Amino acid sequence: PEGPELHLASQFVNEACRALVFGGCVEKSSVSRNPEVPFESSAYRISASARGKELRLILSPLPGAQPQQEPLALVFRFGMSGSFQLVPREELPRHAHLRFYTAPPGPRLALCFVDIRRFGRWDLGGKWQPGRGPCVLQEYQQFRESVLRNLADKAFDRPICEALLDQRFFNGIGNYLRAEILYRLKIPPFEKARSVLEALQPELTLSQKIRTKLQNPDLLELCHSVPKEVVQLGGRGYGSESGEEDFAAFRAWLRCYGMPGMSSLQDRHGRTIWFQGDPGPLAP
Numbered sequence: 001p002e003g004p005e006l007h008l009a010s011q012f013v014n015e016a017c018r019a020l021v022f023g024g025c026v027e028k029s030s031v032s033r034n035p036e037v038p039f040e041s042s043a044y045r046i047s048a049s050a051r052g053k054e055l056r057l058i059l060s061p062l063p064g065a066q067p068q069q070e071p072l073a074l075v076f077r078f079g080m081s082g083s084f085q086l087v088p089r090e091e092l093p094r095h096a097h098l099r100f101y102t103a104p105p106g107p108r109l110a111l112c113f114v115d116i117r118r119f120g121r122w123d124l125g126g127k128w129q130p131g132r133g134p135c136v137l138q139e140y141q142q143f144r145e146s147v148l149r150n151l152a153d154k155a156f157d158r159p160i161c162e163a164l165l166d167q168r169f170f171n172g173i174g175n176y177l178r179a180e181i182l183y184r185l186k187i188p189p190f191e192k193a194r195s196v197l198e199a200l201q202p203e204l205t206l207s208q209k210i211r212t213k214l215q216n217p218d219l220l221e222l223c224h225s226v227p228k229e230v231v232q233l234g235g236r237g238y239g240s241e242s243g244e245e246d247f248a249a250f251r252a253w254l255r256c257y258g259m260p261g262m263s264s265l266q267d268r269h270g271r272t273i274w275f276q277g278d279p280g281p282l283a284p
């Protein structure tokens with residue numbers, strides 16, 4: 001998955017669980033190789049936040065809840081088929097590998113992490129993955145400063161289409177985003193990364209920026225604004241029944257990835273990069 005989805009998923013959990021009270025233990029399917037979640041509370045609230053391609057759930061016991069339980073955070077990585085779904089207790093999805101059940105007050109429901117392929121993972125604790133940089137959606141300024149400050153890193157000797165997938169610097173950018181981003185600026189996917197960013201190495205006022213930056217956004221600005229477009233398009237459809245409608249809108253939003261006429265190549269990782277025109281000097 002890519003940044004927009006994790007963000008939208010987090011929004012869904014928070015909104016759906018805002019007034020729900022969960023209780024009991026957190027159940028993991030026997031088949032799941034992920035860790036068991038030591039937790040038990042008669043009444044707790046679930047909240048979530050996202051950062052790049054990671055979603056963090058926080059389980060917070062309500063006052064009076066028993067037995068004594070400290071808040072617990074869990075960080076998830078969705079994988080190809082992972083998702084969060086809120087369903088009726090008697091309709092648990094066949095591939096629900098981690099489940100949280102609502103407490104007696106009101107209709108019995110279950111928040112589930114569903115993942116048929118089981119590529120998804122979760123770890124105990126609220127610590128984000130070591131080395132992942134700032135989220136391109138929620139931490140734009142920190143994301144940008146970190147890239148410019150570390151341009152000397154060997155990560156930028158690779159072609160731009162490959163560096164865009166390096167989560168140490170572009171946390172949240174995935175295969176369809178790098179294609180759409182590069183297409184907006186018509187930047188050859190195999191141009192040396194540092195070469196495309198070098199020029200970017202309380203200065204300009206708003207009037208100056210409006211005159212020379214507004215209609216000429218740079219690669220780093222788009223790493224934030226492009227995925228933000230997907231977030232706006234997605235609205236509050238995650239977790240609902242508007243899946244068909246949402247994918248149709250996403251399909252229409254794409255300008256390059258998997259589009260007719262567009263060229264395609266395989267990077268050193270085997271991932272397909274879509275582009276239009278010149279592939280670049282470092283093309284395989």
